[PDB]
């Protein structure tokens, strides 16, 4: 799952229990930024500022979506961090933690970690953050 | 607690009748205990996933679910049971935070799920989401 | 530990690991409001708003103090709630959770619960909240 | 339950196991942590106090197991927080097989083992930790 490979399938429940995949209508045929995080890693002030910024900036852009994938094991901790940190974009978590199959299939090694996917489900960037991320999204969007 | 025997309990249900694991409706089955209380139930998805499981395995005779509440008020307890349609067996002995059941099962926070094997061994605890449903999908 | 009994001894670590007891300089000779809570029981907007009001109203008043005693078992979850909810007063937690010795000795049955102590360490009111708490303190201070 | 086998390299690159001379036949406190996820200072401050308190007690040892993937962040953290007891890391991160086998789901996490390798307690902090050790040692 290096850059240019196909992104592994996922189907993970959101804050309302609805399972989301890349082929959901909110995500299909878009550049999709996945941000892997967990409440038990907070605070992440710098990582969340960049994400919040990108979420406001491309709010209306139909070619972009963001999905938070949490490695929380407790839905109360997960929701509390979503509310406290205003994580307003789509959020999913299957409460498996460090043993998460999705983290393992995405080869995620530390948290937080951003993975950028192309409209055809190809990995375009791994652990992209900061200026490099703002830059990349400017070019692509 | 994983691997040790589940402590004995005898707790009254909504009608006032005492239940233990040796009850006919529980014995020799995988038994999911969910500890909860109406006064500490801040995430609706906790009950919704248990409702989905109750529906999904209701015809499986090797599975049963038991809600144990740390409520202290019978009326708040029955009200939450109806409000969220907690259909499976429901017990409560009205001791609250000093519940001896909770202390023997090493229940430290609410809500907590504990999965017991047919001979009463603790197989898993504190499980939610895929950690809960994948484990059950494997056992049943 | 009914009203008019002695408050049991406690010695519990705060956010910096210092053990606090009723005999600490910050609490001695003061009316002491204990609030028992847990991050795993949130949100509690009504309860917190009430405590936050009192904290502010009586900040200058050297005869009144507040102490949050949490039944959290995880430091991170407890701190996250302290910050999200701005629980500025003193906070202690020994990470024993719902079987806590302190909870049991104060005969706390549910959460959140307030216990009001006198300067001599005697129990003035158990499970006191809302208007009854605002009026009781006006009357005492 | 029994403690899975591991063999992990320390700061000097030597492999350590529960069977190592320095751990064998002792109560062993394992602390799982990483420098990239250590947001609460009191986690380490309490372990440092225990390291100090039980220093002479030869029935007891501590081992830190880090999920770091960068040797320089790992050692910097060890020096900064003065993590003076034994430290291992094998640089696999969240994919750590040791973390998976000990069912470590979140960080930090403490696991207490008996001399014979059985998991006596896990996920304990504060009085849950210091009280259980007082009662064993």
From TrEMBL, chain D:
Top-rank lineage group of the source organism? Bacteria
Q: Where in the cell is it found?
A: Cell envelope
Any stretches that span the bilayer, and where are they?
none
Name recorded for this polypeptide: Possible thiol-disulfide oxidoreductase
Please give the range of the full-length protein represented by this chain. 208 to 344 of 356
